[PDB]
Amino acid sequence: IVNGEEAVPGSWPWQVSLQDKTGFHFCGGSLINENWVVTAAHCGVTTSDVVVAGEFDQGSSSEKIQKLKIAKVFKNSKYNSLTINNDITLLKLSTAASFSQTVSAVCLPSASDDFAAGTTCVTTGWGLTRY
Amino acid sequence: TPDRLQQASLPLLSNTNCKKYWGTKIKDAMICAGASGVSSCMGDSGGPLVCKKNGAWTLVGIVSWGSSTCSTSTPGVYARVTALVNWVQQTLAAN
Protein backbone atom coordinates (compact mmCIF):
# COMPACT_ATOMS: atom_id res chain seq x y z
CA ILE A 1 0.00 0.00 0.00
CA VAL A 2 1.11 3.53 -0.99
CA ASN A 3 0.63 6.38 1.49
CA GLY A 4 -0.64 3.97 4.17
CA GLU A 5 0.48 3.96 7.79
CA GLU A 6 1.88 1.12 9.87
CA ALA A 7 -0.92 -0.72 11.65
CA VAL A 8 -1.10 -1.78 15.28
CA PRO A 9 0.55 -5.20 15.54
CA GLY A 10 -2.22 -7.80 15.40
CA SER A 11 -5.07 -5.29 15.13
CA TRP A 12 -6.00 -6.93 11.79
CA PRO A 13 -6.06 -10.63 12.75
CA TRP A 14 -7.48 -12.33 9.63
CA GLN A 15 -4.66 -10.75 7.60
CA VAL A 16 -2.22 -13.43 6.52
CA SER A 17 0.92 -13.66 4.45
CA LEU A 18 1.19 -15.92 1.42
CA GLN A 19 4.87 -16.97 1.19
CA ASP A 20 6.66 -19.36 -1.20
CA LYS A 21 9.15 -21.97 0.02
CA THR A 22 11.74 -19.24 -0.35
CA GLY A 23 10.15 -17.08 2.38
CA PHE A 24 9.08 -14.50 -0.21
CA HIS A 25 5.82 -12.59 0.47
CA PHE A 26 3.94 -12.78 -2.85
CA CYS A 27 0.30 -12.32 -1.84
CA GLY A 28 -2.06 -11.71 1.08
CA GLY A 29 -5.03 -13.69 2.38
CA SER A 30 -7.90 -13.29 4.83
CA LEU A 31 -8.72 -15.93 7.42
CA ILE A 32 -12.46 -16.53 7.06
CA ASN A 33 -12.12 -19.33 9.64
CA GLU A 34 -9.49 -21.61 11.18
CA ASN A 35 -9.53 -24.01 8.21
CA TRP A 36 -9.91 -21.55 5.34
CA VAL A 37 -8.10 -18.76 3.61
CA VAL A 38 -9.60 -16.33 1.10
CA THR A 39 -7.31 -14.78 -1.49
CA ALA A 40 -7.22 -13.81 -5.14
CA ALA A 41 -7.27 -16.35 -7.95
CA HIS A 42 -4.58 -14.42 -9.81
CA CYS A 43 -2.15 -14.96 -6.95
CA GLY A 44 -1.50 -18.46 -8.34
CA VAL A 45 -1.14 -20.16 -4.93
CA THR A 46 0.08 -23.78 -4.82
CA THR A 47 0.32 -26.44 -2.13
CA SER A 48 4.04 -25.71 -2.02
CA ASP A 49 3.08 -22.28 -0.75
CA VAL A 50 2.74 -21.52 2.94
CA VAL A 51 0.21 -19.59 4.99
CA VAL A 52 1.70 -17.22 7.60
CA ALA A 53 -0.66 -16.23 10.43
CA GLY A 54 -0.24 -13.60 13.13
CA GLU A 55 2.85 -11.92 11.72
CA PHE A 56 3.39 -8.14 11.72
CA ASP A 57 7.07 -7.60 10.95
CA GLN A 58 8.11 -9.83 8.10
CA GLY A 59 11.62 -9.17 9.35
CA SER A 60 11.02 -9.79 13.04
CA SER A 61 12.55 -12.96 14.51
CA SER A 62 10.72 -12.74 17.85
CA GLU A 63 7.25 -13.15 16.36
CA LYS A 64 4.97 -16.02 17.33
CA ILE A 65 3.63 -16.56 13.83
CA GLN A 66 1.88 -19.69 12.56
CA LYS A 67 3.25 -21.25 9.37
CA LEU A 68 0.29 -23.28 8.11
CA LYS A 69 0.22 -25.60 5.14
CA ILE A 70 -2.17 -25.75 2.23
CA ALA A 71 -3.90 -29.07 1.61
CA LYS A 72 -5.81 -27.89 -1.49
CA VAL A 73 -6.42 -24.93 -3.81
CA PHE A 74 -10.11 -24.53 -4.73
CA LYS A 75 -10.12 -21.99 -7.59
CA ASN A 76 -13.33 -20.21 -8.59
CA SER A 77 -14.26 -22.19 -11.73
CA LYS A 78 -15.62 -18.85 -12.97
CA TYR A 79 -12.29 -16.99 -12.74
CA ASN A 80 -11.54 -15.29 -16.07
CA SER A 81 -7.77 -14.97 -16.36
CA LEU A 82 -8.35 -12.88 -19.50
CA THR A 83 -10.17 -10.17 -17.55
CA ILE A 84 -9.43 -10.90 -13.88
CA ASN A 85 -13.15 -11.29 -13.14
CA ASN A 86 -14.28 -13.41 -10.16
CA ASP A 87 -10.71 -13.01 -8.88
CA ILE A 88 -11.05 -15.30 -5.85
CA THR A 89 -9.46 -18.54 -4.65
CA LEU A 90 -10.13 -20.57 -1.50
CA LEU A 91 -7.44 -22.20 0.63
CA LYS A 92 -8.01 -25.33 2.62
CA LEU A 93 -5.48 -25.78 5.42
CA SER A 94 -3.80 -29.04 6.31
CA THR A 95 -3.34 -27.83 9.85
CA ALA A 96 -6.07 -25.74 11.49
CA ALA A 97 -5.08 -22.19 12.47
CA SER A 98 -5.01 -21.64 16.25
CA PHE A 99 -7.28 -18.60 16.79
CA SER A 100 -6.00 -16.16 19.38
CA GLN A 101 -5.74 -12.53 20.37
CA THR A 102 -3.90 -12.15 17.05
CA VAL A 103 -5.35 -14.91 14.83
CA SER A 104 -9.10 -14.72 14.09
CA ALA A 105 -11.75 -14.60 11.35
CA VAL A 106 -13.25 -11.96 9.13
CA CYS A 107 -16.98 -11.77 8.50
CA LEU A 108 -18.47 -12.34 5.07
CA PRO A 109 -21.27 -10.25 3.61
CA SER A 110 -24.67 -11.69 2.74
CA ALA A 111 -24.97 -11.80 -1.05
CA SER A 112 -27.71 -9.43 0.15
CA ASP A 113 -25.47 -6.78 1.78
CA ASP A 114 -25.40 -3.21 0.49
CA PHE A 115 -22.17 -1.15 0.64
CA ALA A 116 -22.65 2.42 -0.63
CA ALA A 117 -20.28 4.51 -2.74
CA GLY A 118 -18.63 7.16 -0.52
CA THR A 119 -18.28 4.62 2.35
CA THR A 120 -14.80 4.60 3.90
CA CYS A 121 -13.35 1.13 4.47
CA VAL A 122 -9.89 -0.32 5.10
CA THR A 123 -7.30 -2.15 3.07
CA THR A 124 -4.18 -3.68 4.66
CA GLY A 125 -1.06 -5.38 3.26
CA TRP A 126 2.71 -5.66 2.89
CA GLY A 127 2.44 -4.53 -0.73
CA LEU A 128 5.07 -2.09 -2.00
CA THR A 129 4.83 1.19 -0.11
CA ARG A 130 6.24 2.82 -3.19
CA TYR A 131 6.32 2.63 -6.93
CA THR B 1 8.46 -3.95 0.24
CA PRO B 2 7.70 -3.13 3.87
CA ASP B 3 8.53 -5.53 6.68
CA ARG B 4 5.73 -3.68 8.49
CA LEU B 5 2.01 -4.21 7.95
CA GLN B 6 0.28 -1.24 6.40
CA GLN B 7 -3.26 0.07 6.66
CA ALA B 8 -5.32 2.62 4.80
CA SER B 9 -8.86 3.92 4.68
CA LEU B 10 -10.43 4.89 1.35
CA PRO B 11 -13.86 5.55 -0.14
CA LEU B 12 -15.78 2.88 -2.00
CA LEU B 13 -16.94 4.02 -5.45
CA SER B 14 -19.64 2.98 -7.89
CA ASN B 15 -18.84 1.03 -11.07
CA THR B 16 -20.37 3.78 -13.17
CA ASN B 17 -17.94 6.44 -11.93
CA CYS B 18 -15.27 3.74 -11.83
CA LYS B 19 -15.81 2.87 -15.49
CA LYS B 20 -15.02 6.59 -15.80
CA TYR B 21 -11.41 5.58 -15.14
CA TRP B 22 -11.08 1.92 -16.15
CA GLY B 23 -13.64 1.75 -18.94
CA THR B 24 -15.16 -1.59 -19.91
CA LYS B 25 -12.65 -3.42 -17.70
CA ILE B 26 -14.76 -2.98 -14.55
CA LYS B 27 -17.11 -5.99 -14.51
CA ASP B 28 -19.91 -7.05 -12.17
CA ALA B 29 -17.67 -9.01 -9.78
CA MET B 30 -15.48 -5.94 -9.19
CA ILE B 31 -15.69 -2.99 -6.81
CA CYS B 32 -13.50 0.11 -6.91
CA ALA B 33 -12.06 2.13 -4.04
CA GLY B 34 -9.34 4.70 -3.64
CA ALA B 35 -8.38 7.46 -6.00
CA SER B 36 -8.13 9.27 -2.67
CA GLY B 37 -4.38 9.91 -2.28
CA VAL B 38 -3.73 6.30 -1.30
CA SER B 39 -3.57 3.06 -3.24
CA SER B 40 -3.13 -0.68 -2.86
CA CYS B 41 -0.02 -1.97 -4.62
CA MET B 42 1.99 -4.96 -5.84
CA GLY B 43 2.13 -7.46 -2.94
CA ASP B 44 -1.19 -6.29 -1.46
CA SER B 45 -3.09 -8.73 -3.76
CA GLY B 46 -5.44 -11.29 -2.21
CA GLY B 47 -5.51 -9.26 1.02
CA PRO B 48 -8.68 -7.78 2.52
CA LEU B 49 -10.83 -4.77 1.82
CA VAL B 50 -13.00 -4.39 4.92
CA CYS B 51 -16.03 -2.33 5.84
CA LYS B 52 -17.44 -2.22 9.36
CA LYS B 53 -20.99 -3.46 9.40
CA ASN B 54 -23.07 -3.32 12.58
CA GLY B 55 -19.99 -3.37 14.83
CA ALA B 56 -17.94 -5.77 12.72
CA TRP B 57 -15.42 -5.67 9.91
CA THR B 58 -16.82 -7.51 6.93
CA LEU B 59 -14.96 -8.75 3.89
CA VAL B 60 -16.26 -6.62 1.03
CA GLY B 61 -13.24 -6.67 -1.35
CA ILE B 62 -10.08 -8.55 -2.37
CA VAL B 63 -7.19 -6.48 -3.74
CA SER B 64 -7.13 -7.71 -7.31
CA TRP B 65 -5.74 -5.09 -9.70
CA GLY B 66 -5.34 -1.50 -10.76
CA SER B 67 -2.68 0.97 -11.80
CA SER B 68 0.63 -0.45 -13.01
CA THR B 69 2.30 2.32 -11.01
CA CYS B 70 -0.14 2.13 -8.08
CA SER B 71 -1.23 5.70 -8.75
CA THR B 72 -2.99 7.32 -5.79
CA SER B 73 -5.27 9.25 -8.16
CA THR B 74 -6.74 6.16 -9.86
CA PRO B 75 -9.03 3.65 -8.11
CA GLY B 76 -7.65 0.19 -7.27
CA VAL B 77 -9.85 -2.75 -8.34
CA TYR B 78 -11.09 -5.41 -5.94
CA ALA B 79 -13.01 -8.67 -6.16
CA ARG B 80 -16.61 -8.25 -4.96
CA VAL B 81 -17.04 -10.89 -2.27
CA THR B 82 -20.82 -10.49 -2.33
CA ALA B 83 -21.06 -12.04 -5.82
CA LEU B 84 -18.66 -14.71 -4.61
CA VAL B 85 -19.88 -15.47 -1.10
CA ASN B 86 -22.49 -17.91 -2.43
CA TRP B 87 -19.67 -19.71 -4.15
CA VAL B 88 -17.56 -19.61 -0.98
CA GLN B 89 -20.44 -20.93 1.14
CA GLN B 90 -21.13 -23.71 -1.31
CA THR B 91 -17.40 -24.49 -1.30
CA LEU B 92 -17.09 -24.78 2.50
CA ALA B 93 -20.24 -26.85 2.93
CA ALA B 94 -19.05 -29.52 0.49
CA ASN B 95 -15.48 -29.61 1.81
Binding site: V8, P9, W14, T102, S104 | S9, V50, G55, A56, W57
Partner: peptide, 10 residues
Protein backbone atom coordinates in the same frame (compact mmCIF):
# COMPACT_ATOMS: atom_id res chain seq x y z
CA UNK C 1 -15.97 -12.90 13.44
CA UNK C 2 -14.54 -9.48 12.66
CA UNK C 3 -13.99 -8.16 16.20
CA UNK C 4 -10.27 -8.00 16.88
CA UNK C 5 -8.95 -8.70 20.38
CA UNK C 6 -6.73 -5.71 19.71
CA UNK C 7 -8.31 -2.66 18.06
CA UNK C 8 -7.08 -1.01 14.90
CA UNK C 9 -6.33 2.65 15.53
CA UNK C 10 -6.95 4.26 12.18
Amino acid sequence: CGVPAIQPVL
